[PDB]
Amino acid sequence: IQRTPKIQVYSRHPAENGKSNFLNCYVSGFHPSDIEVDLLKNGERIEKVEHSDLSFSKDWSFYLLYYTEFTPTEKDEYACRVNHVTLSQPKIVKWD
Amino acid sequence: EHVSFHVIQIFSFVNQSWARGQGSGWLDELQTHGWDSESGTIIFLHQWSKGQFSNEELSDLELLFRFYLFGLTREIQDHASQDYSKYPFEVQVKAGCELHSGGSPEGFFQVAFNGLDLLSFQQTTWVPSPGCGSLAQSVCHLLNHQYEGVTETVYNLIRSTCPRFLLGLLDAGKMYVHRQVRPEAWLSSGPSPGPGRLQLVCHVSGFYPKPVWVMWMRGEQEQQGTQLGDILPNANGTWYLRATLDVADGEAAGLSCRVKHSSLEGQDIILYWRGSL
Numbered sequence: 001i002q003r004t005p006k007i008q009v010y011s012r013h014p015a016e017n018g019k020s021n022f023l024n025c026y027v028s029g030f031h032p033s034d035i036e037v038d039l040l041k042n043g044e045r046i047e048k049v050e051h052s053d054l055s056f057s058k059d060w061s062f063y064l065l066y067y068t069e070f071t072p073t074e075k076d077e078y079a080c081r082v083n084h085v086t087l088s089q090p091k092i093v094k095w096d
Numbered sequence: 097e098h099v100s101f102h103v104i105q106i107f108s109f110v111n112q113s114w115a116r117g118q119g120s121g122w123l124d125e126l127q128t129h130g131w132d133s134e135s136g137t138i139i140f141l142h143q144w145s146k147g148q149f150s151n152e153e154l155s156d157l158e159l160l161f162r163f164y165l166f167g168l169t170r171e172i173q174d175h176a177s178q179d180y181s182k183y184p185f186e187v188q189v190k191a192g193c194e195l196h197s198g199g200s201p202e203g204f205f206q207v208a209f210n211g212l213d214l215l216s217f218q219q220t221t222w223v224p225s226p227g228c229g230s231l232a233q234s235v236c237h238l239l240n241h242q243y244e245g246v247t248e249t250v251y252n253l254i255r256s257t258c259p260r261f262l263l264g265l266l267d268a269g270k271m272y273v274h275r276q277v278r279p280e281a282w283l284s285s286g287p288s289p290g291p292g293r294l295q296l297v298c299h300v301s302g303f304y305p306k307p308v309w310v311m312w313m314r315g316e317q318e319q320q321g322t323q324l325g326d327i328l329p330n331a332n333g334t335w336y337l338r339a340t341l342d343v344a345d346g347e348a349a350g351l352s353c354r355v356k357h358s359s360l361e362g363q364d365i366i367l368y369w370r371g372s373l
């Protein structure tokens with residue numbers, strides 16, 4: 001049983017340029033729990049992130065919430081990057 | 097209004113002599129406790145995480161958990177097949193209780209191995225999982241036969257201690273678990289459904305409790321195509337929901353997102369789709 005991570009990226013608040021916000025990345029439905037989740041700013045990893053403790057659903061697949069406080073600007077692209085043993089390549093989901 | 101408390105454990109053996117462990121306590125979907133492996137102690141995540149238990153009961157529980165982890169590692173070594181074939185592997189334990197409407201407690205203690213059911217604890221015996229095979233039976237034989245109070249301690253923990261603590265938690269956390277948090281909503285354009293088509297997205301973020309009503313509307317007519325995403329967690333215990341609607345270009349005008357939530361007290365959030373002055 002090896003299930004691949006679903007990645008959902010969303011902000012806590014509407015994207016206002018120059019206003020503080022939270023970028024969430026919810027990664028769920030993966031197994032085994034070994035995983036590399038990073039929030040990216042301009043393709044570079046964000047160190048100042050938080051994440052929930054590993055948890056899992058009734059089907060035993062795992063889920064993690066990541067979030068980082070950020071200030072979106074026009075030039076800055078943010079993303080959530082997940083590497084997993086079920087992935088041939090790191091999956092990168094951008095934020096709108 | 098069924099409520100539940102789970103202690104979960106995840107541990108992965110990367111090889112025969114090296115394993116990672118992780119543990120937490122969850123009031124429904126709210127994490128209330130973590131575990132500090134490097135002192136073997138409970139992390140109380142909220143002011144109220146002691147949930148009406150004394151420091152003595154809680155430190156007894158900690159001691160219990162440590163004796164449990166010690167026995168677990170000792171036994172995993174002494175009965176590991178030891179061949180590199182069976183590694184890496186991952187065990188998940190979900191133990192706890194569910195309190196039903198009338199007050200009837202239900203205990204559970206389920207284990208998975210590599211994300212498949214391994215065994216559970218029913219009444220007073222370790223039931224191996226049907227779909228699984230001989231590993232399940234081996235572990236159940238060890239737990240049913242070659243142990244002492246292990247099985248009875250699990251019984252009391254999940255049948256008596258756990259509902260007691262669950263209720264203490266809800267009570268101590270009453271101001272948190274009974275709170276109301278007003279969502280905010282905003283509109284965006286989602287991934288284009290196609291040429292001449294728009295994806296209207298209504299984001300509702302920051303509501304708690306979880307029940308929420310979101311619809312795209314044309315006046316009072318609910319748009320049938322509306323899709324509700326998963327209700328996603330925010331940090332600090334609120335929820336997020338996207339309600340989306342694909343519409344023809346030229347049919348977007350007039351559509352609005354309507355949000356009802358217990359915290360809004362009749363005053364629904366209404367946002368009209370704009371996109372072009």
Ligand SMILES: CCCCCCC[C@H](C)CCC[C@H](C)CCC[C@@H](C)CCC[C@H](C)CCC[C@H](C)CCCOP(=O)(O)O
Binds near residue numbers: 246
């Ligand atoms: C390295 C990984 C370790 C993970 C350990 C997980 C521990 C959690 C996170 C501690 C916080 C939980 C919270 C304080 C819960 C309160 C304690 C009571 C109310 C729950 C009891 C019921 C529980 C769900 C069962 C857990 C049983 C345990 C896993 C097995 C012990 C039996 O073994 P033993 O023979 O030593 O008695």
Ligand SMILES: *[C@@H]1O[C@H](CO)[C@@H](O)[C@H](O)[C@H]1NC(C)=O
Binds near residue numbers: 113
């Ligand atoms: C077991 O895995 C751990 C962690 O990956 C590593 O430190 C250790 O060297 C490994 N032992 C082996 C491969 O025999």
Ligand SMILES: NCC(=O)NCC(=O)NCC(=O)O
Binds near residue numbers: 052053055064
């Ligand atoms: N760990 C991801 C997740 O689902 N977290 C749930 C959470 O934080 N819930 C807070 C609440 O239910 O009030």
Ligand SMILES: O=S(=O)([O-])CC[NH2+]C1CCCCC1
Binds near residue numbers: 108115116133134168
């Ligand atoms: O900090 S840590 O080294 O990841 C804690 C690991 N202890 C668990 C892993 C082996 C199974 C039972 C206990």
Ligand SMILES: O=S(=O)([O-])CC[NH2+]C1CCCCC1
Binds near residue numbers: 055056104124
């Ligand atoms: O009833 S419920 O709100 O969906 C409980 C969900 N809690 C999850 C995390 C802790 C272990 C169980 C799965």
Ligand SMILES: O=S(=O)([O-])CC[NH2+]C1CCCCC1
Binds near residue numbers: 123124125126273307
């Ligand atoms: O509305 S809801 O958020 O889906 C209910 C889930 N349980 C909550 C209330 C009691 C435990 C903390 C979280």
Ligand SMILES: CCCCCCCCCCCC
Binds near residue numbers: 172176
């Ligand atoms: C503290 C008691 C823990 C007992 C669990 C032991 C599991 C060993 C698995 C061996 C497979 C044959």
Ligand SMILES: CCCCCCCCCCCC
Binds near residue numbers: 176177187207209
């Ligand atoms: C390869 C060994 C599999 C080990 C499964 C351990 C299950 C632990 C159950 C703990 C109940 C007290």
